Structures are given as structure tokens and as C-alpha cells.
Amino acid sequence: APLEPVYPGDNATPEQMARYYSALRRYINMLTRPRY
Prior knowledge:
The structure is a monomer. The chain is mainly alpha-helical. Helix content is 50%, strand content 0%. It has one helix and no strands. It is elongated. This is Pancreatic polypeptide. It comes from Homo sapiens (Human). Hormone secreted by pancreatic cells that acts as a regulator of pancreatic and gastrointestinal functions probably by signaling through the G protein-coupled receptor NPY4R2.
């Protein structure tokens, strides 16, 4: 929380929770891209 004025960050959502985890899956896969 360095300095983020306007637009607060309270109340999570299932539509963002399923996305956070789905992004982690794809992100891991991207981080393990074909780079032999």
C-alpha cells in the first residue's frame, strides 16, 4: 500500500479468485516455456 488514492481494494469476488489461480497456472506454464 505505497500510495493508491481513489478506487479502494476491499471485498474479494469468486470471479476474480478463480482468475487469480487460473493466471498462476498459465503463468507457471509461461515461466516454463520451451527455452532449451
